[PDB]
Amino acid sequence: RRVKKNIENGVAHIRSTFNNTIVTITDEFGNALSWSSAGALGFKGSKKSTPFAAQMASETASKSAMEHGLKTVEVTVKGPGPGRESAIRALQSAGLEVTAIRDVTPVPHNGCRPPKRR
Amino acid sequence: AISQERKNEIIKEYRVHETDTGSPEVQIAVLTAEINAVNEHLRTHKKDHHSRRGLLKMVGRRRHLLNYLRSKDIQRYRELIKSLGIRR
Amino acid sequence: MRTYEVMYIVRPNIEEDAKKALVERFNGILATEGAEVLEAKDWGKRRLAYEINDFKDGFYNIVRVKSDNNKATDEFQRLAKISDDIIRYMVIRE
Amino acid sequence: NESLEDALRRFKRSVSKSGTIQEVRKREFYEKPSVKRKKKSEAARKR
Amino acid sequence: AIKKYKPITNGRRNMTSLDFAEITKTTPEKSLLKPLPKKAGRNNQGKLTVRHHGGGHKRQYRVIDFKRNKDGINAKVDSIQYDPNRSANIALVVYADGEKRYIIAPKGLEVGQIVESGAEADIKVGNALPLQNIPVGTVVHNIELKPGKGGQIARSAGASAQVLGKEGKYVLIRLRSGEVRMILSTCRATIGQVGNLQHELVNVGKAGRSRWKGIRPTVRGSVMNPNDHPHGGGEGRAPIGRPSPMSPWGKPTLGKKTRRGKKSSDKLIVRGRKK
Amino acid sequence: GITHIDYKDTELLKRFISERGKILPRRVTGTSAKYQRMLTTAIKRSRHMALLPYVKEE
RNA sequence: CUUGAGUGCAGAAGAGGAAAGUGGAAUUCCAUGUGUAGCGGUGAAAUGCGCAGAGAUAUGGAGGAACACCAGUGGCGAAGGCGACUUUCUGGUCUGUAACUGACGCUGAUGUGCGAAAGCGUGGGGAUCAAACAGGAUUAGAUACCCUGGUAGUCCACGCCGUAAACGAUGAGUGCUAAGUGUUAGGGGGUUUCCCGCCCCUUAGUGCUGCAGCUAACGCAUUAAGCACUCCGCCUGGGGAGUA
């Protein structure tokens, strides 16, 4: 530490918009360890959107998460996208011991005015 | 507003017979008090859309009843336009 | 004349001595105008579903007072903003 | 011993049952306050 | 109130005034007065230093007990009254003791009202006290900077300060000038914004009023022959050529600061915007 | 019947909300409409005193 | 004289209004921490942002907005419109009762006041959004769609303006004229050991389907576009023109 903070229960932040999905894993609070993006995995455009691109970022950062060492990991989910069910199926095979999955993608309470078009 | 107490109070002075609830001297009196109180309500609350609507309707109704009165009797009519002091 | 219920909520972290002094003080605020303090209660040490400022739980408290309509909030829900210990409040009718 | 896919299913109705999809669907772009009620005055007989 | 004088001639067209229904009495005391001369912008030497002052109406000085030193004791107001020396009206006091001392006029201060100057005083208008004993979100004025000097800030017409938060010491403020300074926690202060607020919303109407005060005419630079002012000279009218629009002793006007970085206030200020 | 709510009937509040923090509508209750109108007000008043949350998603 | 109208008596509901006062999420920004190399957006890209450390993640703070689920072909409003909560003031509506007045009523030119959004002025505040606008891309061409941003304004008070597809494309009121089915506020009767369960009747509103009748036809049909009465306003081929 502060590079090698060693734990056994962190958390996995996930988002999947309709143009991209990224992922990153940290400790409980948390603070950064690693991430990945389909645009960093070489992909582009539509391929950022695929479930397949979600899997590969999930793994390819998850390995950096077992760098310092970690088995259990909980989930955050923003960004309704297609990869939010294939990425996880990837993640169990990543060799981890997940405990919880709670969706937070906030529906506000009539606060802000969205864009108009279309 | 008014209370049902003062509502049942004023009739005592201006009822012709103790069973009375009509005898429009009743009506114009009670309503007169109301239009005043709502007048200063509307003073402190300069704007209301419903309020003055209610006043105007109370008024046209009042003067209608009053014209039935002066149509019927005049000694009364005088008597209470100088009791309540209204319509010059 | 009207039946005004009322709540107040204080921290659990104060010493109770503050809670006592604030009770007697508080109801002293209410009944002085001619209002008729009627019914008090301590709904109790109670866990919340929400962290107000940084806390977990606290003291729910109820009193009730019957009066004519222009005597209680006039100073109550001013002092509510003043009192550091006071957290939230609420006032209703029948 | 509830497999992480079964958790993916419990989570799948967690999302499908809280209506977390269709409100973002509904709030993503502006709606005039009249057009959601042309919307519901045309859904006023479909149902 | 402000008032539309209607045009009869060409110097009452666009003008306005006050109407002075904020006042009880017209005539002030004898006792608490102090005379005053007008120097009109010039040193002990005699030399003019500041341009376009001078030439006014007679007036006098009227003392104020800004410090509000006598604390805990109660008092009242007996009257409101004009003061030319300032933009804002002011309010007399008769102590329950018996002394008499002019003090400021906040918004909505009416005769018969009472006041104190003690830290026991709970938050109402005029009740002066140390700021430590105040919540957040309270508009206040006649503030101290060092204690016991007598209040200095937010003392103008109408609006005033606003407290934002607190360390135990120092203590913060948000200001009319949109900026912030950490302040001692034990300094004296008051409650309530200042009174007269439309003092900005006069249209003077003409030039004599400005002389009646007094003020007196200024002059531009694009007419002066060039010995005096940089912008001067130039046949025909003067499209100024030198950038950095100067001031008659050099030292430009526009953009350039004068706040120097060596003052002891290096660490108090934050979020400075309105300068 | 006949007064509601304010905070006093949690085994009807809990009957009439979901785990998450939202309302179960008129349909799964099938309750009358006047108690629907009173009760929803009572809910909001009971959330504002933090007896229960705006969203319990934890 | 009361059956009209109205006051009374007892009841019922209501996003009805105006002023005030709190609360939470959510966006944007900022500070701080973690931490590396992309984020973002597209039909496909770029414009843009990114080593000054972004985005992401996390704590805290700021402040402006609009107040999620409930919400319903549900309600209230004369019309526009009215949806976080509480408070102060206040109007209006329906039911049943009826003892009081005793035809006091309907319409209403002129006249008078209310009135979406846009906008103008005095000020204030100004988070999001976005005319105008700058830029990229697209296009044979694109001032446009599309992407990137951004002003006015959106927002508060006070004033003004006085229009709309202001639509039920149906003027106000009175009264009669087949049914059946729902939803809302009530009332009354029965049943039920207690109706909470349920049945029956009725008022008011509210929708749906459909006889007669009407209709050029579409279609309305007890909330009539039927049957009749009273009052107001409006039309006389189109364009020119709601113009001079």
UniProtKB/Swiss-Prot annotation, chain A:
TM region positions: none
UniProt GO BP: translation
GO cellular component: cytosolic small ribosomal subunit
GO molecular function: rRNA binding; structural constituent of ribosome
Keywords: Ribonucleoprotein, Ribosomal protein, RNA-binding, rRNA-binding
Superkingdom of origin: Bacteria
Similarity annotation: Belongs to the universal ribosomal protein uS11 family.
Function: Located on the platform of the 30S subunit, it bridges several disparate RNA helices of the 16S rRNA. Forms part of the Shine-Dalgarno cleft in the 70S ribosome.
Subunit and interaction comment: Part of the 30S ribosomal subunit. Interacts with proteins S7 and S18. Binds to IF-3.
Protein name as annotated: Small ribosomal subunit protein uS11
From Swiss-Prot, chain C:
GO molecular function, one term: structural constituent of ribosome
Classification via InterPro entries: Ribosomal_bS6, Ribosomal_bS6_CS, Ribosomal_bS6_sf, Ribosomal_S6_plastid/chlpt, Transl_elong_EF1B/ribsomal_bS6
Gene Ontology biological-process annotations: translation
Annotated Pfam families: Ribosomal_S6
Assigned keywords, A-Z: Ribonucleoprotein, Ribosomal protein, RNA-binding, rRNA-binding
Transcription regulation among keywords: no
Regions that span the bilayer: none
GO cellular component: cytoplasm; ribonucleoprotein complex; ribosome
HAMAP family: Ribosomal_bS6 (MF_00360)
Family per record: Belongs to the bacterial ribosomal protein bS6 family.
Record function comment: Binds together with bS18 to 16S ribosomal RNA.
NCBIfam families for this protein: S6 (TIGR00166)
Protein name per its UniProtKB record: Small ribosomal subunit protein bS6
Organism whose genome encodes this protein: Staphylococcus aureus (strain NCTC 8325 / PS 47)
UniProtKB/Swiss-Prot annotation, chain D:
Lipoprotein as UniProt keyword: no
Highest taxon, organism lineage: Bacteria
GO biological process: translation
Position of the signal peptide: none
Alphabetically ordered keywords of this record: Ribonucleoprotein, Ribosomal protein
GO CC terms, sorted: ribonucleoprotein complex; ribosome
A GO term for molecular function: structural constituent of ribosome
Protein family membership: Belongs to the bacterial ribosomal protein bS21 family.
Protein name, as recorded: Small ribosomal subunit protein bS21
Organism: Staphylococcus aureus (strain NCTC 8325 / PS 47)
Gene symbol of the encoding locus: rpsU
Portion of the full sequence shown: 9 to 55 of 58
Curated annotation (Swiss-Prot), chain E:
Single biological process term from Gene Ontology: cytoplasmic translation
Keywords: Ribonucleoprotein, Ribosomal protein, RNA-binding, rRNA-binding
InterPro entries (alphabetical): NA-bd_OB-fold, Rib_uL2_dom2, Ribosomal_uL2, Ribosomal_uL2_bac/org-type, Ribosomal_uL2_C, Ribosomal_uL2_CS, Ribosomal_uL2_dom3, Ribosomal_uL2_RNA-bd_dom
One Pfam family here: Ribosomal_L2_C
Similarity remark: Belongs to the universal ribosomal protein uL2 family.
Subunit structure comment from the entry: Part of the 50S ribosomal subunit. Forms a bridge to the 30S subunit in the 70S ribosome.
Protein known as: Large ribosomal subunit protein uL2
Organism: Staphylococcus aureus (strain NCTC 8325 / PS 47)
Gene coding for it: rplB
